[PDB]
Design a binder for this molecule. Structure first.
Ligand SMILES: Nc1ncnc2c1ncn2[C@@H]1O[C@H](COP(=O)(O)OP(=O)(O)OP(=O)(O)O)[C@@H](O)[C@H]1O
Ligand SMILES: Nc1ncnc2c1ncn2[C@@H]1O[C@H](COP(=O)(O)OP(=O)(O)OP(=O)(O)O)[C@@H](O)[C@H]1O
Ligand SMILES: [Mg+2]
Ligand SMILES: [Mg+2]
Lengths: 285, 51, 101, 262, 72, 50
């Protein structure tokens, strides 16, 4: 029981990098619209990776942490993959279910590894897939395990202040809800930029999202992607990832390798679900 | 900073604690800590968004 | 609100126009400015009712200046920031109508 | 000889399993043990460097802590109990009049499993995941058993609550290893039986029990989607009332069809 | 088994495991269940169905003659 | 000794059977826990001024 040697930061990883030993799988072309938010995600990620010093010379306060919020399905995670593919920096895919308590001291030790790894071979991106199971708006804190989850989040706060004044991109995290968030996590200096993702978007931002998933697939000369833009007006990004996927299943009942408009409107009818924004429940015009 | 008080910003949170873990029992005790480390300013920021 | 436990009430009003100009200046003391920018001129473009609005006009001016990639924050970025932040006032929750009963 | 074999085991000693967490140096390896705490440990010349990769289980001694040999992977004692359910069988037409629902069911399920190669022609994303929903008695579990038998692929058959444990964090571990196991086993088909309160909403104003729900729920989505994507390997989600679940389970793309069995 | 924001989501996880062992992977074919209940208004819809509880025995208010037997 | 020792003081041990050795040169205040996890730096009147 004495200190007989020291270990480099690189070694003793939670898990090795996925961004200079693997390459993210989704590109920025597979993102359709949210162009207003795309100007912002290259502000949030890309500019602190190539050079932090641009901000310094102006003297404007940097952005620190990236908060992605929205109702699920809107491509928060897909976007993380996107800008990591364009920038071609290091990326570390961890999750909070690899951080969760299992042994005594598991929680703090596991949080520390990823930051040590990112900083030594900086500039780097740390991704925590979600923080909805650690960070919960309320805690009972009258049981040992609820204070363990809290130990894991508290270390994350401490490592976040540590991560600042570095040319790394501060932790990426997404949340599926508005009541996962605490008034000590969204504090500026912890999460600066709050990139929106609505289920509202406008007619142009619905329009681009259909066309990209149609670029992926075969089409027929009678296929209409633009007759769906006005049917429903409360969509998310991956409810279109299902309608299109279903058109390739209805086609295989025919034994077809192009997509028909019959296939695409039959899939439209499902997966939408009850909606009151659509033009049939609307008489306020 | 001028008065040399401990600026204790409370926020209506259960996350600031991890050692008692409810606000009701941390009213006496918060006072007692602010007396240990006196002078102090207990900035209990109520919000009333809670629930 | 029991009577005798409240011997001081500090109301912070919506900014005056002498106060609202100085909030812009506070943030700009870390920043580089192209010489000749008056944040009192911008304050007369603003009408405001909170000093949060003017903090967003400065943040925007340095992020427009980041987009350009110039060291100085230029004067058109503070023109664009007020109109961009006012659009943002109509998108966080409407509040300036004049359309009343 | 029956007792000679017992002597030879007896004068030997046990091994304690690890896995290679990270390579440090030529003769020094960092492992994370299956019991927990990490060590630095050595190697004999009974193993090669080109024969070790990470996540590969290794032996250690319990008296010197040195690797002598490569060890196959481990897989839950729990998930072996699911492969021992196969009873409740019925023919391929075993649901009268809902035979149409079988057709819808195989388009996601049986056809890309057997041949992904015809769906390259179509050019769409690999089909994954289905929800069965309907009032009790409509053979949602019966349709699950029937697509297990007819395909004849590896099959589980997970109880909602035999993947929960007292410790909140072992409950996450089981399904992590259940999706790994499904990737070791071509055409593994996973019926989650009676999900209601293990994939439920955010809740968290009741007991502390409700934070185990979340913890487990994230696990499922991260396997399905990320730098792991399943087209070999199929999800059948059986639920007893449609609107009981978290909205991420109401987001199709993991769960591409929401099939109604009348 | 639609509960929100309470700890009846802990309670139902011991209900669903029972319904798992009344799904047929046999081990419920000679293994039986009697159940007594005092309120029949709140029974689960997955226990209304047969294959879980199959035979449904009503217990009445005693008839004229029956009361006299009971006393005796 | 017992008059150099008071409550809530961190010590170092040489486990000869848990033989108290020295005071520890570190402590984390329990009030500072709250303040940490909040995380606040100092301000003056140029952050209010105007
Ligand atoms: N808008 C979209 N258009 C096309 N494909 C999409 C879209 N959104 C997601 N996908 C595809 O769906 C899969 C999963 O995406 P991902 O898990 O990143 O989504 P998410 O919305 O962040 O999920 P969650 O609901 O768990 O937060 C990937 O194969 C991805 O390419
Ligand atoms: N749709 C059906 N068609 C024919 N037989 C059926 C059907 N549904 C149930 N059965 C019969 O009832 C038995 C038990 O029903 P099962 O356990 O499959 O019920 P379930 O309602 O699908 O289950 P759960 O309530 O868990 O969703 C079956 O073994 C079969 O004999
Ligand atoms: Mg997510
Ligand atoms: Mg069943």
């Amino acid at each position: 029981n004495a200190l007989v040697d020291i270990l480099p930061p690189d070694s003793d990883s939670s898990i090795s990098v996925m961004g200079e030993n693997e390459k993210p799988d989704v590109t920025y072309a597979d993102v359709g619209g949210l162009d207003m938010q795309k100007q912002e995600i290259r502000e949030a990620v890309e500019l602190p990776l190539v050079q932090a010093d641009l901000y310094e010379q102006i003297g404007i306060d940097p952005p620190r942490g990236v908060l992605l919020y929205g109702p699920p399905g809107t491509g928060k995670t897909m976007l993380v993959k996107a800008v990591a593919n364009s920038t071609k920096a290091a990326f570390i895919r961890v999750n909070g279910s690899e951080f969760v308590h299992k042994y005594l001291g598991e929680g703090p030790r596991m949080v520390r590894d990823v930051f040590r790894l990112a900083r030594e071979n900086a500039p780097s991106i740390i991704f925590i897939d979600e923080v909805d199971s650690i960070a919960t708006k309320r805690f009972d804190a009258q049981t040992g395990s609820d204070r363990e989850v809290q130990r894991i989040l508290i270390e994350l706060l401490t490592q976040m202040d540590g991560f600042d004044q570095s040319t790394n991109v501060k932790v990426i995290m997404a949340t599926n809800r508005a009541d996962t968030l605490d008034p000590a996590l969204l504090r500026p200096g912890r999460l600066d930029r709050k990139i929106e993702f609505p289920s509202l978007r406008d007619r142009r931002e619905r329009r681009l999202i259909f066309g990209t998933i149609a670029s992926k697939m075969s089409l027929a000369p009678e296929a209409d992607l633009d007759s769906l833009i006005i049917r429903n007006d409360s969509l998310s990004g991956a409810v279109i990832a299902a309608i299109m996927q279903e058109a390739g299943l209805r086609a295989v009942r025919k034994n077809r390798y192009v997509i028909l408009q019959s296939d695409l409107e039959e899939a439209y009818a499902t997966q939408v679900k009850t909606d009151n924004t659509v033009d049939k429940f609307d008489f306020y015009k | 900073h001028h008065t040399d008080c401990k600026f204790i910003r409370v926020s209506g949170a259960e996350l600031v604690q991890k050692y008692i873990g409810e606000g009701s029992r941390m009213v006496r005790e918060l006072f007692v800590m602010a007396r240990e480390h006196a002078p102090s300013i207990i900035f209990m920021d109520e919000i009333d968004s809670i629930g | 609100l029991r009577p005798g436990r409240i011997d001081r009430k500090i109301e912070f009003p919506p900014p005056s126009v002498a106060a609202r100009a100085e909030i812009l200046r506070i943030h700009s003391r870390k920043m580089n400015l192209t010489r000749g920018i008056n944040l009192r001129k911008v304050a007369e473009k603003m009408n405001g009712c909170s000093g949060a609005d003017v903090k967003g006009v400065c943040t925007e001016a340095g992020m427009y200046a980041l987009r350009e990639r110039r060291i100085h924050v230029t004067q058109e970025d503070f023109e664009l920031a007020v109109g961009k932040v006012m659009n943002k006032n109509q998108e966080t929750a409407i509040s300036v109508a004049k359309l009343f009963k | 000889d029956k007792t000679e074999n017992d002597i030879k085991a007896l004068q030997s000693i046990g091994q304690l399993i690890g896995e290679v967490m990270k390579e440090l140096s030529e003769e020094k390896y960092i492992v994370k043990a299956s019991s927990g705490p990490r060590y630095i440990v050595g190697v004999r010349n009974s193993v090669d460097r080109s024969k070790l990769k990470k996540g590969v289980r290794v032996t250690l001694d319990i008296t010197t802590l040195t690797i002598m040999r490569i060890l196959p992977r481990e897989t839950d004692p729990l998930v072996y109990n699911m492969t021992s359910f196969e009873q409740g069988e019925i023919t391929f037409d075993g649901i009268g009049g809902l035979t149409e629902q079988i057709r819808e069911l195989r388009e996601v399920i049986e056809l890309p499993l057997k041949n992904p190669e015809i769906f390259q022609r179509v050019g769409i994303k690999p089909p994954k995941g289905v929800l069965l929903y309907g009032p009790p008695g409509t053979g949602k579990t019966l349709l699950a058993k029937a697509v297990a038998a007819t395909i004849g692929a590896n099959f589980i058959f997970s109880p909602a609550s035999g993947i929960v444990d007292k410790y909140i964090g072992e409950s996450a571990r089981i399904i992590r290893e259940m999706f790994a196991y499904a990737k070791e086993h071509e055409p593994c088909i996973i019926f989650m039986d009676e999900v209601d309160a293990i994939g439920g909403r955010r809740f968290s104003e009741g007991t502390s029990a409700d934070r185990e729900i979340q913890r487990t729920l994230m696990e499922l989505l991260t396997q399905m989607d990320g730098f792991d994507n399943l087209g070999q390997t199929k999800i059948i989600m059986a639920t007893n009332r449609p609107d009981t679940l978290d909205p991420a389970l109401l987001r199709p793309g993991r769960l591409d069809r929401k099939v109604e069995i009348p | 088994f639609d509960s929100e924001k309470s700890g009846d989501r802990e309670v139902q996880r011991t209900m669903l495991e029972l319904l798992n062992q009344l799904d047929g992977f046999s081990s419920d074919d000679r293994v039986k269940v009697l159940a007594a209940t005092n309120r029949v208004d709140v029974l689960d819809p997955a226990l209304l169905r047969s294959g879980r509880l199959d035979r449904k025995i009503e217990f009445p208010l005693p008839s004229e003659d029956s009361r006299a037997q009971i006393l005796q | 000794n017992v008059k150099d020792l008071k409550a809530s003081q961190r010590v170092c041990l040489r486990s000869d059977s848990y033989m108290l050795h020295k005071v520890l040169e570190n402590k984390a205040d329990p009030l500072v826990s709250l303040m940490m996890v909040e995380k606040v730096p100092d301000s003056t009147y140029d952050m209010v001024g105007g």
